[PDB]
Amino acid sequence: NLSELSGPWRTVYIGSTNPEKIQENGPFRTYFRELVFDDEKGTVDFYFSVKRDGKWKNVHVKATKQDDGTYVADYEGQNVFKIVSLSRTHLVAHNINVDKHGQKTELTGLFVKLNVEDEDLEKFWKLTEDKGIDKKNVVNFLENEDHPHPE
Amino acid sequence: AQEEEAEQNLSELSGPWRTVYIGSTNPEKIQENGPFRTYFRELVFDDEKGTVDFYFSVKRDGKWKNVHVKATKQDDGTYVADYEGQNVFKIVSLSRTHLVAHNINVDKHGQKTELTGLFVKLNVEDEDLEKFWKLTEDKGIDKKNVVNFLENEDHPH
Numbered sequence: 001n002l003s004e005l006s007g008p009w010r011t012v013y014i015g016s017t018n019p020e021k022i023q024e025n026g027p028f029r030t031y032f033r034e035l036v037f038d039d040e041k042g043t044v045d046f047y048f049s050v051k052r053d054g055k056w057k058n059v060h061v062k063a064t065k066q067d068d069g070t071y072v073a074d075y076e077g078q079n080v081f082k083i084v085s086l087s088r089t090h091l092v093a094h095n096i097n098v099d100k101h102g103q104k105t106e107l108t109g110l111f112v113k114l115n116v117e118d119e120d121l122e123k124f125w126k127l128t129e130d131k132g133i134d135k136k137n138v139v140n141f142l143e144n145e146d147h148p149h150p151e
Numbered sequence: 152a153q154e155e156e157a158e159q160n161l162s163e164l165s166g167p168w169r170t171v172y173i174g175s176t177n178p179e180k181i182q183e184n185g186p187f188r189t190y191f192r193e194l195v196f197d198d199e200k201g202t203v204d205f206y207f208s209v210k211r212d213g214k215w216k217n218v219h220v221k222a223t224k225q226d227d228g229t230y231v232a233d234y235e236g237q238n239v240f241k242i243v244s245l246s247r248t249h250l251v252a253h254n255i256n257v258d259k260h261g262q263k264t265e266l267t268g269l270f271v272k273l274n275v276e277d278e279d280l281e282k283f284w285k286l287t288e289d290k291g292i293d294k295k296n297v298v299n300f301l302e303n304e305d306h307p308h
């Protein structure tokens with residue numbers, strides 16, 4: 001039951017046994033946007049952004065769960081990763097990437113979830129109505145293309 | 152084992168904040184290039200000075216701008232701030248994770264705009280940080296080889 005963890009997630013820290021993978025232009029200097037867990041298909045879709053070559057790219061990768069519990073996915077090689085601790089607000093993970101040249105890299109990561117509550121959303125909506133504001137004149141900043149760049 | 156909560160206070164509320172929704176009686180204010188299409192980065196609450204400092208980014212003209220605005224509390228509990236005119240805003244709901252607010256903006260042309268906003272706080276508990284560090288050490292990853300993506304996002308470009 002990890003479906004309820006789907007939604008907007010943000011990268012906090014990423015560590016690597018190979019600094020080149022996470023320095024500027026590194027393939028694993030990933031800013032998470034959204035995570036989607038599917039308990040029936042045993043899969044996880046990652047939506048994130050990476051500045052590769054000189055520009056920003058939005059990437060989508062689907063990970064599949066294995067009998068051992070680990071997940072495997074194809075991104076800058078073959079990756080096999082393990083969630084170490086999850087909860088409503090956090091995800092600490094460890095990933096093993098093996099690139100095109102057989103180079104093995106171990107990465108670690110802390111990601112936090114952006115939890116928007118119903119109780120709070122409702123309050124926002126009542127207030128927006130009280131001020132006679134039209135739902136059309138409301139901007140969603142969580143799923144917006146027009147956003148700033150961290151680098 | 153043991154469960155513990157950090158002692159709360161406006162001080163504990165400071166930190167990274169993100170904007171979820173912003174509503175406006177005047178759509179020009181929050182459209183692309185509008186001064187109120189603001190992406191929050193951090194907020195600093197000061198109990199003693201009765202102030203709140205805002206850090207956010209707005210795409211003005213053709214490029215992104217980081218902006219800092221200090222607001223001061225009033226006896227009536229509202230806050231005043233100077234940004235793209237004069238602003239008086241009231242926090243209708245605040246807790247460890249959310250902020251719902253109502254702002255009244257009078258621009259340099261006498262025009263009044265009323266805005267509504269929902270913001271969410273990005274909380275990072277120490278238990279999680281402590282668990283991320285232990286894992287990092289276990290794989291023999293040296294701290295110098297760790298990037299803080301949160302601070303990068305709070306200090307963009």
Ligand SMILES: CCCCc1nc(N)[se]c1CCC
Pocket residue numbers: 014028029030046061073074075079081082083093094095109
């Ligand atoms: C362990 C959860 C995140 C794994 C992971 N770390 C990245 N950095 Se991008 C990614 C998915 C694609 C390989």
Ligand SMILES: CCCCc1nc(N)[se]c1CCC
Pocket residue numbers: 173187188189205220232233234238240241242252253254268
């Ligand atoms: C009500 C607190 C947030 C008010 C507020 N909303 C923005 N949008 Se920018 C900002 C600070 C400058 C007036």
